[PDB]
Amino acid sequence: XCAIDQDFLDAAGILENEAIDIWNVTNGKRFSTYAIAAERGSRIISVQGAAAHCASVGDIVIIASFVTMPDEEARTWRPNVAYFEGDNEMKRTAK
């Protein structure tokens, strides 16, 4: 796979080539792949190769990455969340 606007990657803290899970609200499908960078500002979310069987243009999806750390560090961990409006325009998150 999935190519993602590099701005979006940065906002969610996801790295190029990092494993990602994708959960499709439109069709229910859930799959795992890795992140490819698309051009900053392109607002692209492109499913490539076999992943094209799991989403179509227009589908609404959640894209997540997961990390590991010790128990103690996990108790104050804060995930990055990026929110969107209209045509993949990033909006500010609340508390």
């Binding site: 609200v25 492109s46 989403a55 243009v57």
Partner: peptide
Amino acid sequence: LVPRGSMIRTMLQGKLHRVKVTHADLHY
């Protein structure tokens, strides 16, 4: 409270919430 342990947790690092797919490309 959850007691402290020595184990490694898998935690949500971050997510894109309700982003919309723009392209689907089976062959590339």
